[PDB]
């Protein structure tokens, strides 16, 4: 059993497991059933930006996703992540397709963790994903293509997405997401993405997630489960 | 009428104007009557650290003050500061003494503002306050001493604090604390301080504050009013 | 007499005052006659990036300018800037036109100064130049337009550049570019620009510069003198 | 054969292999015989700071080490590190004792790498070394003690250093120290250390180093060879 915290860019409504009946952004604390969601107008073929922000003093996990034309969606959830995650974690990106499909392309990814100037800190930014990105752990169908972009889920040589794909990219170094001696733990994550499908109803979405160090893809996690959970509890 | 947002390190309980009956940290939104407070054990003669954190997605102003031995106090307040402050501001530090006194010594001050990589951003750190600090606006009794520390309120050549003192230090450049085109505005401030008095009941406290650009010290603002407000409304 | 250090993007060869017979990048230490230059292929209508880097341990001022297609020009000069500049400075951007013209448009500007975690530090990034940018000091013809870009030299409502223009933009807060107690002083500057002319031989260029605090535009400084020097000595 | 670039804090003069006849700081490019050295007054029992700075435009590797009382030593060497190191590396700290001994205690370590806002970047800061620091690779005698400090070489429960010790600490994630598409590669490293011996002539020193990813401690590298080289060529 992996422990999971995640911000989800859910493009396909699986209303049976709690989804609203539209594309949406959500905050997932140890369950695919988001503790809080917001309506999200996904824009086929456009490059969006997700910003995730957490603060251990305020104990609020906040996320906003937006597109160059302005359209944004925002969700927030009161949660003390020091009561959820282990001391050391890995951070990652995941994505899935199912019966409906889409590109799950990452163009850039940034993360910053700070423990507080006796500050422990970790920060990375990736704007070009080389073929052998030695500081990323790729799982499932995730690969890096010839444009220097990360393809979380399978895409054909044409460029057309495929269904029933799962893929995840984890940063190589573990993250001291909190330590006992800290008065301020905090982190911020940013990624830009390109989701494009022929489907007038694409699937399934992208997430940013935090998990225990040794986390691999749970069996039975494609489509609605976003490569994060074994079931829908 | 200046517009003021402030985190206050209130060392003296003025219970008539809403104070708890102990030293405390508070969040002040356009009034000395803190919207939220927390018990704070001030430690005479020790160097404390204040950390202030705000996020426009979460709309939570959080603050924590602590000492090297660990003792911390934390307060948070839900407020959308985009609905309170003007677009351009100055950030500052203030402090007062009244009938009871204390040193209000600043040893270091950091600020970071980010508008979101089309990011407008401003960040400064001051660990030594030279005699003519050309990037600080000093108001009232504030001066910089021979140890490279900032003395917000008057201290004699001996080193003994004086009463009925007011002093403020504002950063020279205005701060674009938000702009309309932003999806993420956020800021963080940090300062270390040394509060020392012969009084078994020192007064009055230090604040970090944000205000309109042309803000000067309001008349009638010493002691309990912390150099921020003209009255106690 | 202002004291000036500058990296120059010289688009027009004024061979009489030391220029090479091509567009070039140069390092200017208290004289328009660059201490060191490099050939630069300016690309009409494209957005370039200039990166300026200095280190007080290595005592090397380095600059590189480049375009999205890759073409770059690099120049370096051994100089101890602690022996040239005053303790407190302002940093800026300037540009000129003369008999030949060009747009001198700034789209983004970043600066970072660090004195060394007892670090004094100042850092700003400007990606949108609002109409009233309260943290920039505009001089001469410099204004901000309706696209959120900074126009160092005059451009007509059409968008066509004009000749005999001078303009400079200085950051509002002075910069502690060095202090005596430092073991490491260092700074880095970045700006992106758009230079466009109908002229098959545009003029005159853009610079990033450091100067004394009270520096205004010297008389007789347009065209080849880049708004920095009173003469060509 | 590992490829090695290193800044060395050489406390013991091994004059047979090129050392000056005093403690010194040096720049080591693929050989223990420093390309450039500087006199260094090591201060027994005091906490020093080393700052290492490199820039791909200036192609100068610079280093400065200093103590709270001010005494500093500075060395610089013109070298294009893009012509020396592989694309992906690990960064580390090493230290040795031999016939003479000393503590080789690291209290803090920071590193920052930037490829240039299409910036790839990696940055970490470690101010407390927990018992199981999951983001450090420890080699040889390196361990973390009960004060949250890293002990590169063996120290007894008393706190007394031991001779013939070797130890290295490498950051877990590889570092894209340069990529072909970059116009600016650069990095900066900082570490604070405590070197203390009963010996009026302690040995051997601490280094910061960059090496190929799979680098382990070369056989025959203790004492004068600083855990970096197999021989003295
Ligand atoms: C019909 O359901 C399937 O397809 C949808 C959309 O692709 C997924 O959400 C789901 O998990 C299944 O894989
Ligand atoms: C007795 O009241 C005075 O002194 C206290 C403590 O110094 C202040 O809080 C107050 O504003 C007055 O100046
Ligand atoms: C002919 O010279 C004029 O025009 C050129 C190019 O515009 C400038 O460099 C120069 O200073 C004069 O203004
Ligand atoms: C006598 O030489 C030995 O001791 C010195 C100082 O400890 C080392 O530099 C050297 O490599 C050997 O180990
Ligand atoms: Ca779903
Ligand atoms: Ca009070
Ligand atoms: Ca010229
Ligand atoms: Ca030696
Ligand atoms: Mn969902
Ligand atoms: Mn109060
Ligand atoms: Mn020139
Ligand atoms: Mn040596």
Q: Transcribe D169-186 into DSSP letters.
A: EEESS-EE---TT-S-EE
What residue has token string 């708890």? Answer: B20
Cα–Cα dist C68/D118, whole Å: 11
How far apart CA A29 and CA A76 sit, in angstroms, is 12
Q: What is the DSSP letter of C83?
A: G
Residue matched to tokens 């091994």: D14
Residue A155 DSSP one-character state: B
Resolution in A: 2.5
* Phi, psi at D15, each rounded to 5°: -60, -20
Distances (CA, A) of B59 to A7, A59, B77, B115, C102: 18, 12, 9, 15, 45
Contact D46, D68 (CB under 8 A): yes
For tokens 């011996």, what's the residue? D197
Q: How far apart are CA C68 and CA C157, in angstroms?
A: 27
The pairing of strands A47-55 and B47-55 is: unpaired
Encode D60-82: b = buried (16+ Cβ within 10 Å), e = exposed.
bbbbbbbbeeeebbbbbbebebe
Which residues of chain C are within 8 Å of residue A117 when distances are taken between CB atoms? 117, 119
Which DSSP state fits A230?
S
Residue C76, SS3 per DSSP = strand
With contact defined as beta carbons under 8 Å apart, do C217 and C140 qualify? yes
Tokens of D76: 């610089």
Contact C203 CB / ligand 3 (< 6 Å): yes
Q: Which residues of B touch C (CB under 8 A)?
A: 88, 108, 117-128, 130, 134-135, 148, 171-176, 179, 181, 213
The residue whose two tokens read 């001022």 is C61
Distance CA B185, CA C134 (A): 17
> CA angle at residue B184 from A25 to B91, to 5 degrees?
150
Please give the span between the terminal C-alpha atoms of chain B, in angstroms, as a whole number.
Answer: 13
Residues with CB under 5 A from ligand 6 (ion): B 10, 12, 14, 19, 224
C-alpha to C-alpha distance for A28 and B1, rounded to whole angstroms: 45
Evaluate whether C175 touches C112 at the Cβ level (below 8 Å): no
Structure tokens at B139: 């108001």
Specify which residues A138 forms β-bridges with: A169
Determine whether the interchain pair B124/C128 forms a contact, defined as Cβ–Cβ distance below 8 Å: no
Segments making up each domain of chain C, as ranges: 4-225
B142 and B152 Cβ atoms separated by less than 8 Å? yes
Pairing of strands D72-78, D166-171: unpaired
For residue C220, what is the DSSP state? T
SS3 call for D86: coil
What CATH number does the domain located at A4-225 have? 2.60.120.200
Among B217, B124, B222, which Cα is nearest to B165's?
B222
* D8, β-bridge pairs: D26, D207
As a whole number of angstroms, the distance between CA C121 and CA C123 comes to 7
Tell me if residue A224 falls in helix, strand or coil: helix
CA-based nearest residue to D103, from D63, D52, D47:
D47
d(CA C74, CA C26): 9
DSSP C101-169: ----EEEEEEEEEEE----EEEEEEES---TT-TTEEEEET-EE-TTS-EESS-B-TTS-B-SS-EEEE
The per-residue DSSP string of C14-44 comes to -GGGT--SS-EEEEEESSSS-SEEEE----T
Distance CA B170, CA B150 (A): 12
- Among candidates C158, C200, C224, which has minimal Cα distance to C42? C200
Beta strands in chain D (DSSP E): 4-10, 24-29, 36-39, 47-55, 60-66, 72-78, 88-96, 105-115, 120-126, 136-140, 143-144, 150-151, 166-171, 175-176, 185-194, 205-212
Q: Cα–Cα distances in Å, from B230 out to B4, B9, B222, D189?
A: 11, 18, 9, 49
- Nearest Cα neighbor of C54 from C161, C208, C231 is C208
Look up tokens 């505005």; give the residue.
B185
Phi-psi sector, D220: left (phi>0), alpha (psi -120 to 50), beta: left
Using what technique was this structure determined?
Answer: X-ray
Distance, CA of A76 to CA of A71 (rounded, Å): 17
CA atoms within 13 A on the CB side of B163: 10
D203 lines ligand 4 (CB under 6 A): yes
Tokens of D231: 């021989």
For residues A197 and D102, give the distance between their C-alpha atoms in angstroms, rounded to a whole number: 64
Cross-strand partners of C25: C9, C38
DSSP D31: S
- The tally of CA atoms less than 13 A away on the side-chain side of residue B203 is 20
Contact at 8 Å (CB) between D28 and D52? no
Angstrom distances, CA of residue C4 to CA of C1, C89, C92, C203: 9, 10, 11, 21
Q: Which residues pair with D190 in a beta bridge?
A: D51, D110
Q: What is the C-alpha to C-alpha distance for residues A232 and A208, in angstroms, rounded to an integer?
A: 18
Which letter does DSSP use for residue D58 in this model? T
* Cα C202 to Cα C210: distance, rounded to the nearest angstrom: 25
Token pair belonging to D155: 């120290």
Rounded CA separation D147/B71 (Å): 19
Q: How far is CA A193 from CA A108, A110, A150, A204, B187, in A?
A: 7, 12, 9, 14, 26
Q: Which of A64, A184, A186 sits opposite B183 (nearest CB)?
A: A64
The Cα D107–Cα D191 span in angstroms is 7
3-state secondary structure of D82: helix
Count of CB atoms situated within 10 Å of the CB of D190:
20
- Compute the C-alpha angle C36/C41/C44, nearest 5°: 130
Enumerate residues preceding breaks in chain C (C to N > 2.5 Å): 116
Q: Which residue of A has its CA nearest to B109?
A: A117
Q: How far apart are CA D47 and CA D196, in angstroms?
A: 9
For residue A53, the CA-to-ligand 10 centroid distance in Å is 29
Dist CA B26 CA B59 (whole Å): 17
Q: Is A48 left (phi over 0), alpha (psi -120 to 50) or beta?
A: beta
3-state helix, strand and coil shares in percent for chain C, rounded to the nearest 5: 5, 45, 50
What do you get for the CA distance between the two ends of chain C, in Å?
Answer: 13
**C202 φ/ψ angles, rounded to the nearest 5 degrees:** -75, 170
Question: Do B76 and A57 make contact, defined as CB atoms within 8 angstroms?
Answer: yes
Which residue, C91, C76, C103, C139, is CA-closest to C11? C103
Sign for the pseudo-dihedral over CA of B39, B161, B138, B127: negative
What is the secondary structure of D190-204 as a DSSP string?
A: EEEEE---SSSS---
Q: In this structure, what DSSP letter does residue D162 have?
A: -
Q: Which among A89, A103, D221, A51 is positioned nearest to B116, based on CA atoms? A: A51
Neighbours of B82 (CB within 10 A): 14
Nearest to B125 among C119, C130, C175 (CB): C119
Name which of C65, C70, C84 is nearest C193 in CA terms: C65
Between CA A135 and CA A156 the distance in angstroms is 25
Q: Using the beta-carbon criterion (under 8 Å), do D184 and C51 form an inter-chain contact?
A: yes
Q: Do you know the residue count of chain A?
A: 233
Sequence-distant (6+) residues with CB within 8 A of D78 are D59, D60
Residue A52's nearest CA partner among A208, A171, A174 is A208
C-alpha to C-alpha distance for C228 and C8, rounded to whole angstroms: 10
Neighbours of A130 (CB within 10 A): 17
Partner residues linked to D125 by β-bridges = A121, D110
Nearest CA in chain A to D179: A130
D223: three-class secondary structure by DSSP: helix
Q: Which two tokens stand for residue A187?
A: 């982190």
- What is the rounded CA–CA span in Å between residue A61 and residue B71? 25
User: What are B37's strand-pairing partners?
Assistant: B26
- Do D66 and D126 meet the contact criterion of CB atoms below 8 Å apart? no
Q: Do A134 and D172 touch (CB under 8 A)?
A: no
Q: Please count the residues of chain B.
A: 233
β-partners of residue C28 are: C6
Distance, CA A34 to ligand 9 centroid (Å)?
A: 6
Are C101 and C94 a contacting pair, CB within 8 Å? no
User: Cα separations (Å) of D67 from B164, D12, D64, D71, D200?
Assistant: 41, 18, 10, 6, 19
From A114, A165, A116, select the one nearest A143 (Cα to Cα): A165
For A146, the 3-state DSSP assignment is coil
Could you tell me which of A165, A159, A164 has the C-alpha nearest to residue A140?
A165
Cβ D100 under 6 angstroms from ligand 4? yes
CB D125 within 8 A of CB D188: no
CA distance C227 to B207: 43
Q: Give the single-character DSSP code of D155.
A: B
- Which chains contact C through at least 3 pairs of Cβ atoms less than 8 Å apart? A, B, D
Calpha distance D27→B226 (Å, rounded): 53
Centroid of ligand 9 to alpha carbon of A12 (angstroms): 8
Identify which of A229, A208, A216, A214 has the alpha carbon closest to the alpha carbon of residue A54: A208
For B88, which residue in chain C has the nearest alpha carbon?
A: C134
Q: How far is CA A75 from CA A3, A72, A212, B76, D21, in A?
A: 21, 10, 24, 19, 65
What is the three-state SS of chain B?
Answer: CCCEEEEEEECCCCHHHCCCCCCEEEEEECCCCCCEEEECCCCCCCEEEEEEEEECCCCEEEEEEECCCCCEEEEEEECCHHHCCCCEEEEEEEEECCCCCCCCEEEEEEEEEEECCCCEEEEEEECCCCCCCCCEEEEECCEECCCCCEECCCECCCCCECCCCEEEEEECCCEECCCCCCCCEEEEEEEEEECCCCCCCCCCEEEEEEEECCCCCCCCCCHHHCCCCCCCC
At residue D137, φ and ψ (nearest 5 deg) are: -100, 110
* Cα angle for residues B136, B138, B144 (degrees, 5° grid): 85
């Amino acid at each position: 059993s992996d422990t999971i915290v995640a911000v989800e860019l859910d493009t396909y409504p699986n209303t049976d497991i709690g989804d609203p009946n539209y594309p949406h952004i959500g905050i997932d604390i140890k369950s695919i059933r988001s503790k809080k969601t917001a309506r999200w107008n996904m824009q086929n073929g456009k490059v969006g930006t997700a910003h995730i922000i957490y603060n251990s003093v305020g104990k609020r996990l906040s996320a906003i996703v937006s597109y160059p034309n302005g359209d944004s969606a925002t969700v927030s959830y009161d949660v003390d992540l020091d009561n959820v995650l282990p001391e050391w974690v890995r951070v990652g990106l995941s994505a899935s397709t199912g019966l409906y499909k889409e590109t799950n392309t990452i163009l850039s990814w940034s993360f910053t963790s700070k423990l507080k100037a006796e500050t422990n800190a970790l920060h990375f930014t990736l704007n070009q994903f080389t073929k052998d990105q030695k500081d990323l752990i790729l799982q499932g169908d995730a690969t890096t293509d010839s444009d220097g972009n990360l393809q979380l889920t399978r895409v054909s040589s044409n460029g057309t997405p495929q269904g029933n794909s799962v893929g995840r990219a984890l940063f190589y170094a573990p993250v001291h997401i909190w330590e006992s001696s800290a008065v301020v733990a905090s982190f911020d994550a940013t990624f830009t993405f390109l989701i494009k499908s022929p489907d007038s109803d694409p699937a399934d979405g992208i997430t940013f997630f935090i998990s225990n160090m040794d986390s691999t893809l749970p069996r039975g996690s494609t489509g609605m489960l976003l490569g994060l959970f074994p079931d829908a509890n």
